[PDB]
């Protein structure tokens, strides 16, 4: 289905549009919805637990303050044998960033691998550059070293992966 | 009901969506609607008095310029035995900020208590960081001291309450 | 009608919503529509001439580059015995700014008077602070002196009129 | 039709609204859709190939990182005897910028000519000032010299073409 | 010159006068506040030195010394001594600390305190960041401000600088 | 060197020449404008001193002194004296005030006033913020500008600096 | 003064003491780290010189020298020599490098390392950018921070400066 | 020291060596490029002086002098003379102009030109803004860059500074 992708057995990433499709989420065994937007209200179906993370998709939004709490929630739900959908509006930046943070913390994968993991399943992902700065700091906190660097290009400072992609 | 919360006997906070539900507001004895958005037009039901506060939810929006005027209006309406709904779009930042300012001015509660008060009723509230700077200044004007400080984290400068929340 | 206000015999200001109401505009003798938004497409009724001014409502949007061209168009239409609607999204910032510039250029009124003129008819107007900087420069170009100053408040730098309003 | 313009035999520029009109695009022989927005989901008709370029219309969005890849795709499609629609939301900034970059790279035209080319067909185009900085750099990379300069006006720094337009 | 008396127990000066023990002893100075990072205390035994190691820059957080320096000048005054607050030019860093002192211990508003120091030492010109910090300190002490930052074509400045430019 | 004549009653210089009374008296100088925070007035009795305590920085609001300094140079000229406007390097602060004077009292546009001072003292190079302020002052005086700020790969500069880089 | 001992093999100082070979030889100094762009190494044969050509500015990337300078002080110590780290004022640049050294080689947290150097040389006052860089280096070494940057009315500063302002 | 030879006709130095005519004449120097605002040309008759009145600051538009200074060094070389490019510290301003010269007239990329000057004068350290400008100039000359600006915990720097911090 358009607008949703499976990342792990207990974690899905999506656009806000899929978040109100009760049947689609039940079909995936989704029990918990993390709404990583300020601007989309929770639909509030009784079937799901809802967690609101009220951030804008902006480089200075302090999304990192939710890295541990959302990652811990995804883990808690999984250990209780449920599954989580982390959604934003576009399924591009806010939700992807939180999924990448979760993969690093609970799947022992570096930031480059965590990006490639999510990107393999949802190729449209594109965390904003501030979110990248925050992910890089979090990676350094977890592993004591970084696998993505911010680099200056003629078009702005971006993670090196974006520069590499621009050259095919 | 989703999208509205009672803060005091004469003050409610909400999303813009509830603002056009005449029956819902009448059921709460609401007589005055403060529309704290630029982008949502007043529905203009004859039953309510309307006050437009045309701000964007942005850290440099000078929301503080409305602290006294909106707080005074809420107080005026209450003393005339009515009730006010302060709404924005998401019910997260603009409206919450104005309600917090009102609680400090007319309920003699410090900024930390005023935040906790609104947060107990509407847990999704999350004033943006600029709004926090402005609330902290207003608190200092009212009480000559502050109960929330802006602190630098790896994810940006935020009020200390957000940093504390990030550690559970 | 909600969302439209008459400023002069040949100039109206509005929200984008009124711009597609053919009957409402015909009732006012409107012959020309200035769409001061990037994000709203022209409805394109055959009855009106359309002018697109594709700006965002942001303090660094260079709205001043349209001061002379839009003001000249309003004047041209008026001298051809028609009338212009200048609309944006909210009828608060972009359209009001262009109307204020027109009043200064073709009605020989200073910036404070031009603001008060539009504000008397549409009290919700609130040009953003960058638009204010640009209006102040344009006023200085026209009259060699200014009647509004940008002042620093605890809540940001704003035109003095906003600070004055905050104290009732 | 409103919201779409032909730039070359194999390249069209549009608003997102036209992008879901299967019949309109088939009528133009469009085989590939480049969706240059984060916020509009691909409609996904089977008849078209879709390419998502998930950028916001903001001066610091690093749109330049897509100059070669989108321009190469337009060229690839054309050489395979198809045609591409590059769309954004408003058909003003993101899509126009990518079309201008393509014209420089594959039609051997300088930046001023490439702008005038697109502007002749879709007069509402108005790339944001950051996009202009990026186009100017790309022009310099391609030709070793520039035909548009950023200039400071009372209303902000803008490409010289915008200043020239403001004086009629 | 390079030295001006501000109160009976407070002098403001340039760095040049700070090491001149005869000049300082003739005014009953017992305490030297060196509001510079770049000038070393001479450390004559007869004076106590307090170093305030700040640059003359708008973001130097000089307001963090308003209470500590004001309190020291006051303490020294009460002990029947006198303080010299000096910087390099006697224009900005030292002037700002003296202004803060006058507000805290002489119960005058910011406008009056600035006018007082300016009358005593006409070259004084706190930098615009120091003015922002003085304005906030005034609001803390009195609950209102008597100088506002205003935008001119040449930058945001305290309104007193705008007024001075037209006279 | 370190001193250049700009008009019959106006000289521009480096700080080094400011204290040389023989040099100044030989040119009939009666007024010294010290456009520095960091150099103290020497205060010879025979000259009147005006201090303009600004740093050579783009955000220093030097434009607040355009009228006051221009008016003083004019007043001194009308009294048959002459003024020296000096800074430290004789490059930026003093050059900017002289340019402003020429526009106000010699009825020349900014381009002409810059070319005039540059011809007299080829090292002059107002900082880019001072240029922004000069441009605004020109627009105030004449209602149009003759120098524009332009973006180059090396920063935003007055177009005269861009032109100079290609010749 | 202008020189303070930090450990048995590490001294911190002002530029003034750097060229005084008798003073340095009396402390067994064999290595001079000149943490300034603006002071030239004197180059007496008997000392090895390392230049760290940074300004005392918040965006100077002094953290790029934390490991290299810390490692050199350690190497010199292990060879039974001693190092002088000097800047101009002995306040910010040199203090910051010494603090970084103490964290890396003396296994103390940032708060303790700052308190240590401050106890030895009370005038020390790293600039706020250097503090940001020290905080990040602390987090790299220990996985937690013991000093936080906090907003005050006078600017964002390390919490230790806020605490000092109230005592 | 304070002087280093870069090519047969180009020397780089500190301000201190600029006035030493014997030192300069011994190297066949006929042209002095003074890349400072703050040091006055000594103006010995035997040398031609070119002043480049820039501060050592990241936003100083030094790139506007890349072609003019490179061309002058080349012209002087072709006339069988030699040029000294000096600043104050011989670290940043003069180093940057020399690097630009090597790219334009010695057909080496930015990495090679930096390595060349650094080998000759190990203290060199262009400021980060000068690096941005050098990178753009390299791209203009060659159509590709060999040094990239990269974010470290201590700021955005040329990758060569990041590499140096780990060795």
Curated annotation (Swiss-Prot), chains A, B, C, D:
Reaction(s) the record says it catalyses: O-phospho-L-tyrosyl-[protein] + H2O = L-tyrosyl-[protein] + phosphate; O-phospho-L-seryl-[protein] + H2O = L-seryl-[protein] + phosphate; O-phospho-L-threonyl-[protein] + H2O = L-threonyl-[protein] + phosphate
GO molecular function terms noted in the UniProt entry: MAP kinase tyrosine/serine/threonine phosphatase activity; protein serine/threonine phosphatase activity; protein tyrosine phosphatase activity; RNA binding
Keywords: Hydrolase, Protein phosphatase
Top-rank EC class of the record's enzyme: hydrolase
Reported function: Involved in the inactivation of MAP kinases. Dephosphorylates ERK, JNK and p38 MAP-kinases. Plays a negative role in TCR signaling by dephosphorylating MAP3K7 adapter TAB1 leading to its inactivation.
Assembly with partners or alone: Interacts with CD28.
Name of the protein: Dual specificity protein phosphatase 14
Species assigned in the record: Homo sapiens (Human)
Lineage: Eukaryota, Metazoa, Chordata, Craniata, Vertebrata
Gene name as annotated: DUSP14
Included stretch of the parent chain: 24 to 191 of 198
